[PDB]
Amino acid sequence: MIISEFDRNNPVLKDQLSDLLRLTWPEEYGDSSAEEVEEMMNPERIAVAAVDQDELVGFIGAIPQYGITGWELHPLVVESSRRKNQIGTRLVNYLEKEVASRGGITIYLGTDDLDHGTTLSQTDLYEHTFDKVASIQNLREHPYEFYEKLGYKIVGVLPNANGWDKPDIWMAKTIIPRP
Amino acid sequence: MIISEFDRNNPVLKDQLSDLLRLTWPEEYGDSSAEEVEEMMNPERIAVAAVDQDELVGFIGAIPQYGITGWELHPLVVESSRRKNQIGTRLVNYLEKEVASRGGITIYLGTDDLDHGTTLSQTDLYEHTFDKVASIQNLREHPYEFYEKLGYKIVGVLPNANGWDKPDIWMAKTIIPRPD
Ligand SMILES: CC(C)(COP(=O)(O)OP(=O)(O)OC[C@H]1O[C@@H](n2cnc3c(N)ncnc32)[C@H](O)[C@@H]1OP(=O)(O)O)[C@@H](O)C(=O)NCCC(=O)NCCS
Ligand SMILES: CC(C)(COP(=O)(O)OP(=O)(O)OC[C@H]1O[C@@H](n2cnc3c(N)ncnc32)[C@H](O)[C@@H]1OP(=O)(O)O)[C@@H](O)C(=O)NCCC(=O)NCCS
């Protein structure tokens, strides 16, 4: 398709990105939505987009959080009408190569469960924490499974992150061969 | 000495803190040291100080990361000459009280293991990940144990975060009674 570095100076593409972020996570992106997008344009971050002739259909970003070795994959979104078509896979694949060329070793992410999309939510995660993580099941097509299919593994959970029994699920992947 | 909100309207204090970090994390603090002190001053974040006579001997901050429910504890520093005296303990307790008052529920943090300070470094954390987490041992007085004693629990690990076999260790605690 046309997956490449995002034009950080295109106010329109950024407006499109802003809308997509509002439509996908209205609880996190609101009026000041434009502010969140500008944060994603910061020079240290990677910003990549899937654009179709002029329409933004997907976006993925990465934040270097530990020197340049540890990067946080944030955010990742594909327009609803174009999902399940490998756009997300391509975006991730593209990101991993770029992160690796910058010196990255590990890409991690936090995928929240606010909608009881997995069995990790609606339960006291301090009781048998890791048995619950190991027996995780997908209840509402939660995206954690999307990442697992791409080689990411659940390496942690933040109990009650977004309110009681609405945890964040930490996943990670080492993107280069161990020398 | 007393523990209270960090008076951001004090240059001397900010300078005292700016140095406190330049003396604890010179690689992470220095150029932006007398700058990251202000990012900690942000009204969104929480800034707490341990002052003795007028000398800042401890500081703790927190960043709201998930709505108002989840907060990241960062940073936490006690002067090296005033450590192992419970200043840290008192800073954490006070921070927990502050977060709860703002409607917060959980406080988490990432304590890195850069120099084989715990059994979690120098091992492939992708293999038997959680058994390794559960059976962690402190090798060189790593600070994760400090947090454990204050009720925090290791809830995850970031394999190779700071370079091969130098992970970050995630710990968390819910600071108020669970609904029943
Ligand atoms: C999650 C998302 C980025 C995935 O992108 P996508 O292009 O739809 O995914 P792909 O088509 O590349 O899917 C690749 C594989 O993962 C699976 N998959 C994709 N989304 C999934 C989901 N939500 N739950 C379970 N499996 C999923 C696909 O079925 C496919 O499996 P297969 O290889 O066995 O056929 C996209 O659905 C999206 O934008 N969702 C809403 C926002 C979101 O949740 N973002 C994630 C940030 S934490
Ligand atoms: C870690 C730190 C914040 C703790 O502050 P402190 O005031 O020295 O700790 P306290 O005196 O409150 O200690 C309370 C308990 O924790 C223990 N403890 C403190 N630091 C410890 C360490 N590094 N390893 C193991 N146990 C430790 C104490 O032994 C005491 O336990 P006890 O009651 O059984 O004796 C302090 O040593 C410090 O400033 N360290 C350097 C900065 C740092 O690494 N911060 C952590 C952020 S990731």
TrEMBL record, chain A:
Q: Which residues are in the N-acetyltransferase domain?
A: 1-176
**Protein residues bound to CoA:** 76, 78, 83-86, 88-89, 110, 141, 145, 149
One GO MF term, please?
acyltransferase activity, transferring groups other than amino-acyl groups
Gene3D superfamilies xrefs? 3.40.630.30
* Binding-site residues, acetyl-CoA: 76, 78, 84, 86, 88-89, 141, 145, 149
Entry-linked CDD domains: NAT_SF
Quote any Pfam family the record assigns: Acetyltransf_1
| The protein's name in its UniProt record | Aac(6')-Ii protein
